[PDB]
């Protein structure tokens, strides 16, 4: 009972491998930090303006009002995430061989669904790890920021809490993330079929990977695919929120790379 | 256990055939002409509608066209909700769930099922109407007023892609059941039995596809991702209904409260 299964495991290993090489902060590490293990250090916790302030010292993170400072923080980290995801996509067999326009298109629409997915790896009901895991910002501090900014994270936490319920590990994510990138239903693709063939193979690999890694958790495959609905809505609420800041913060600059992704859509 | 899954599949199918008079198999027969017996009356332009309103009885008439057409789509939806409701009752486990959860699962699942089955009565040029007696063109629909001109366009968008999967009634019966037993509907009181049931339905669906479409074993996954396509359309629709909520009897408003 090991026919084409071999091919699929091989692909799984390949992606898991690229994933480790493309993302310095994996779920496994973020968990060792959040559950107080001994393989990792403990984070500094920001829960208020006061705490935040000592955090500048204690943490330091490559960086006028607090809300905007934090907002500018996510942008920089998001930009970095895009770089990592772009580097990971290139390792997906067949991706770099597709039409360049479509490669740009798949990344344009796939990058955020992947950022929030992976962002769940650094979250628990109470907060989120920051500065490569050196810090932890509580859900509450974030939910209290100035009128518009404090509404950015709550829906991510809500998704994270439900998504983490599936209890997936980095090896599962590597494939699932690869499925998201290769979506032949993205607006403006010029050559859908090639893209779909790849995703089809990825899907078979993820299906096998979920049965083998979570034998007791039946229909995990079915439940995970359904999670896409949550992702799309997160993206939507987010862009609208961005529209608001753009008209209320005329002195604020949205990172060019982010402007290009968010552009048309 | 495979035999139990096939049994569940036959049961849902037999029940589907009894709750939905106009099946996909029948509909496809009418759309391709495989049944020249009774071809449908076409409604391509303003003039034909007027004539069709005379030919076909249409039980939704009491004069601005665009609205009349909409009230028709609503009347049919209310009927569809009763059919779906009778079908759900036959899904093993459903009636044993808490009553409030039954109502909840139906309340949030009828739209998804309606548009799913609507795909069955459509092709790129139009949708079959009034029990198959008619056929309203896609172009005629597009060419409607402001808030109405883009009411159905989204459904046709979905329909063409959904019909690409080439599913038949026995596949749909299981798929529809899966959509009903969704454990993530807001306000549920006892999620465990719901997901337990969906679990079994997905197993039955997975086997049904592999047997009924041996030459395309990724179909299950593809079918599942179409479920998210459905939720988006339901979002766009309720949203549009608000742009319509902007006006367009009080006893009638009660019947179509939703
Ligand atoms: C601000 C615009 O939001 C982004 C999306 C986005 C939103 C929130 C978000 O939360 C993470 C914040 N975040 C930080 C915030 C301040 C300082 C460091 C980090 C940090 C370090 C490592 C990892 C994460 C980190 C990460 C990305 C976009 O629109 O592309």
Q: How is chain A split into domains, by residue range?
A: 1-265
**Cα-atom radius of gyration of chain A, to the nearest Å?**
19
Return d(Cα B204, Cα B7) in angstroms, integer: 9
B56-86 b/e (C-beta count within 10 Å ≥ 16 → b): bebeeeeeeebeebbebbebbeeebbebbee
Classify B134 as helix, strand or coil: strand
- CATH superfamily of the domain spanning A1-265: Retinoid X Receptor (1.10.565.10)
Contact B40, B30 (CB under 8 A): yes
Does A117 contact ligand 1 (Cβ within 6 A)? Answer: no
Phi, psi (rounded to 5 degrees) for B91: -75, 120
Best probe of the B interface among A178, A226, A230, by most B CBs < 10 A, is A226
β-pairing, A127-130 vs A123-124, is antiparallel
**Strand arrangement, sheet containing A127-130:** A44-46, A135-138, A127-130, A123-124
Lookup: tokens for B102: 């039954």
Q: Based on the number of CB atoms within 10 Å of its own CB, is A32 exposed (0-12), middle (13-18) or buried (19 or more)? A: middle
Which pair of structure tokens corresponds to residue A169? 């590990």
Q: How far is B229 from chain A (nearest CA, A)?
A: 8
* Residues paired with B123 in a beta bridge: B126
> Residues A12, A171: contact at Cβ < 8 Å?
yes
Pair of tokens at residue B237: 């629709």
Alpha carbon distance A236, B224 (integer Å):
22
Provide, as residue numbers in chain A, all residues whose Cβ is less than 8 Å from the Cβ of B198: 219
Gaps in chain A with C–N over 2.5 Å, residue before each: 63
Longest dimension (CA), chain A: 63
Ramachandran assignment for B132, one of left (phi > 0), alpha (psi -120 to 50 degrees), beta (any other): left
B221–A207 CB contact, under 8 Å: yes
Beta-carbon count within 10 A of A185 CB = 15
d(CA B125, CA B137): 6
In this structure, the number of other CB atoms found within 10 A of the CB of residue A227 comes to 18
- CA angle B119/A177/B109 to nearest 5° reads 30
In which residue are the tokens 């958790």 written? A217
Interchain contact A246–B (C-beta under 8 A): no
The label of the residue with tokens 């990971």 reads: A88
Rg (CA), chain B: 19
Q: How many Å lie between the centroid of ligand 1 and the Cα of residue A70? A: 8
Distances in Å between the Cα of A136 and the Cα atoms of A85, A127, B63, B172, B222 are 23, 7, 63, 47, 38
Cα torsion A13, A15, A18, A19: sign: negative
CB A78 near ligand 1, within 6 Å: yes
d(CA A167, CA A209): 14
Pick from B218, B229, B232: CB nearest A203: B218
Q: Which of A116, A110, A61 is nearest to A88 (CA)?
A: A110
Element housing B123 (H / E): strand B122-123
Name the nearest CA neighbour of A238 among A161, A153, A177, A158. A153
Indicate which atom in ligand 1 lies nearest the CA of residue A73.
16
Q: What angle do CA A138, A141, A146 make, to 5 degrees?
A: 150
Taking the C-alpha atoms of residue B202 and residue B5, their distance in angstroms, rounded to an integer, is 10
CA-nearest residue for atom 29, ligand 1, is A75
A24 CB neighbour count, 10 Å cutoff = 11
User: Cβ(B180)–Cβ(B91) under 8 Å?
Assistant: yes
Mapping DSSP onto H, E and C, the string for chain A reads CCCCHHHHHHHHHHHHHHHHHHCCCCHHHHHHHHCCCCCCCCCEEECCHHHHHHHHHHCCCCCCCHHHHHHHHHHHHHHHHHHHHHHHHCCCCCHHHCCHHHHHHHHHHHHHHHHHHHHHCCEECCEEEEHHHCEEEEHHHHCCCCCCHHHCCHHHHHHHHHHHCCCCCHHHHHHHHHHHHCCCCCCCCCCHHHHHHHHHHHHHHHHHHHHHHCCCCCCHHHHHHHCHHHHHHHHHHHHHHHHHHHHHCCCCCCCHHHHHHHCCC
Q: What share of chain B is helix, strand, coil (3-state, %, to 5)?
A: 70, 5, 25
Residue A128 in contact with residue A122, Cβ under 8 Å?
yes
The C-alpha angle B110, B116, B117, rounded to 5 degrees, equals 90
Q: Determine which helix (DSSP H) or strand (DSSP E) holds B128, and give its type and residue range.
A: strand B126-129
Distance CA(B109)–CA(B104), nearest Å, equals 8
Which of these, A33, A108, A112, lies nearest to A74 by C-alpha position?
A112
Question: In chain B, which among 132-171 make CB contacts under 8 A with chain A?
Answer: 161
Rounded Cα distance between A47 and A55, Å, is 10
Could A232 and B229 be called an inter-chain contact, meaning their C-beta atoms sit closer than 8 Å? no
Phi, psi for residue A176 in degrees, rounded to 5: -55, -40
Note whether B221 contacts A: Cβ–Cβ < 8 A: yes
Q: State CA A91 to chain mean position distance.
A: 17
Residue pair A4/A86 in contact by the 8 Å Cβ criterion? no
Give the chain A residue whose CA is nearest to the CA of B219: A200
Q: DSSP labels for B184-204?
A: T-TT-S-HHHHHHHHHHHHHH
Of the candidates B155, B138, B196, B172, the residue with the CA atom closest to the CA atom of residue B19 = B172
Instruction: Give Cβ neighbours of residue A195 (< 8 Å, ≥ 6 apart).
Output: A98, A102, A106, A182, A183, A184, A189
Distance of CA A118 to the CA centre of its chain: 3
Is residue A13 within 8 Å of A93, Cβ to Cβ? no
Q: Which two tokens stand for residue B94?
A: 């459903």
B1-258 falls under which CATH superfamily? Answer: Retinoid X Receptor (1.10.565.10)
Distance from CA of B202 to the nearest CA of A (A): 7
**Ligand 1 pocket mutation pick from A56, A78, A261 by most atoms within 8 angstroms of CB:** A78
Contacts 24+ apart (CB under 8 A), A185-189: A185/B161, A185/B229, A186/A105, A186/A106, A186/A108, A186/A109, A186/A110, A187/A105, A187/A109, A187/A265, A188/A105, A189/A102, A189/A105, A189/A106
Partner B contacted by A4 (CB < 8 A): no
For ligand 1, atom 11, which residue shows the shortest CA distance?
Answer: A74
DSSP H or E segment with residue B129: strand B126-129
**Minimal C-alpha gap between B233 and chain A (Å):** 11
Say how far residue B128 (Cα) sits from the centre of its chain. Answer: 13
């Amino acid at each position: 009972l090991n026919p084409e299964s071999a091919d699929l495991r091989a692909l799984a290993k390949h992606l898991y491998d690229s994933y480790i090489k493309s993302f310095p902060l994996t779920k496994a590490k973020a968990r060792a930090i959040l559950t107080g293990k001994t393989t990792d250090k403990s984070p500094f916790v920001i829960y208020d303006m006061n705490s935040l302030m000592m955090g500048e010292d204690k943490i330091k993170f490559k960086h006028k009002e607090v809300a905007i400072r934090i907002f500018q923080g996510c942008q920089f980290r998001s930009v970095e995430a895009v770089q990592e995801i772009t580097e990971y996509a290139k390792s997906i067999p067949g991706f770099v061989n597709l039409d360049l326009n479509d490669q740009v298109t798949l990344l344009k629409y796939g990058v955020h669904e992947i950022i929030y997915t992976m962002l769940a790896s650094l979250m628990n009901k109470d907060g989120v790890l920051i500065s490569e895991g050196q810090g932890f910002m509580t859900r509450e501090f974030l939910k209290s920021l100035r009128k518009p900014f404090g509404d950015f994270m709550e829906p991510k936490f809500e998704f994270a809490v439900k998504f983490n319920a599936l209890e997936l590990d980095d090896s599962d994510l590597a494939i699932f993330i690869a499925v998201i990138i290769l979506s032949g239903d993205r607006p403006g693709l010029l050559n859908v079929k090639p893209i779909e063939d790849i995703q089809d193979n990825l899907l078979q690999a993820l299906e096998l990977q979920l049965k083998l890694n979570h034998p007791e958790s039946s229909q995990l495959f079915a439940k995970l695919l359904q999670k896409m609905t949550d992702l799309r809505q997160i993206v939507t609420e987010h862009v609208q929120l961005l529209q608001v800041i753009k008209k209320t913060e005329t002195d604020m600059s949205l990172h060019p790379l982010l402007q290009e992704i968010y552009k048309d859509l």
